[PDB]
Amino acid sequence: SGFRKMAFPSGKVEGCMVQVTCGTTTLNGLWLDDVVYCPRHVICTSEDMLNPNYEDLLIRKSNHNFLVQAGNVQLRVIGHSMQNCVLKLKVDTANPKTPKYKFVRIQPGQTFSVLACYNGSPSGVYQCAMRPNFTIKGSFLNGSCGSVGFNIDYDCVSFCYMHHMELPTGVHAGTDLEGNFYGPFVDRQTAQAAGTDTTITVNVLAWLYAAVINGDRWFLNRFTTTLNDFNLVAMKYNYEPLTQDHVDILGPLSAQTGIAVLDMCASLKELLQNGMNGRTILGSALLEDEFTPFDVVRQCSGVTFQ
């Protein structure tokens, strides 16, 4: 019992983090097999940032202009290429600590763990969600670029995020490991604004199920609703529309608790329309939307990784 925002154990990803320096700039790279992945703006001066021509800037960079350090040892860079907004530095040594891994591009609403790194060294681990507006609400300072977001599937690390930028409102933007930004963001110092930060409705419902599993039941009401009636209220509160796919995904939690998804939707509608009246749910004073239904099952069933 109890329910916490819980990250994956970071051990497997800690062994992949290195420091990448190009002229003036030091940030983090991910060393998998004989390739180091890092944000392509490692090549930019602060001047360059306003309007970079990365292809032009890259012409003036050779293998020896990329300093890659794994703890205290230099890796020899024997190749480089640009794929979208990431650099791939070929090194002459396969990372002996390369875990089983995949590159995945996650969907909005999906959660992952961030290992915040500075100078190739891990500083801390926390859980994030890809927001519907394709931002993340992270904790990133100057030096954190190239830090990665990941999920673990038993022994397989799925890398889904590389950190690139901060936006107004203190939210963050980055790419998958093929270097394609999530959302419309570009790696340039220009006026960019996120979009409406809508709530992940299916994740709020998953978290309400987690509360009932943990004996926190005060918000269950005597009402039911329809998808269409719920979505009419959802839209007003900037909630994502709930689909039958979402209902289906909550099936196991509904089964566990004996509360129909539509009954829980009616409970959520009353919390949206009436607020919490100074009460809390799993020690939160607002409706938490960074737990997926899988996240709740994992934590409430104690699924493990190795």
Ligand SMILES: *[C@](O)(C(=O)NC)[C@H](C[C@@H]1CCNC1=O)NC(=O)[C@H](CC1CC1)n1cccc(NC(=O)Cc2ccccc2)c1=O
């Ligand atoms: C990254 O390059 C790094 O760590 N380098 C060593 C940083 C990480 C940033 C710094 C502070 N918090 C972070 O998460 N990324 C940047 O500095 C980017 C690089 C750009 C993408 C190529 N960056 C540079 C300049 C400007 C901005 N963004 C803003 O400042 C946007 C903004 C505008 C107005 C108000 C508030 C924010 C970058 O993100």
Ligand SMILES: [Cl-]
């Ligand atoms: Cl809160």
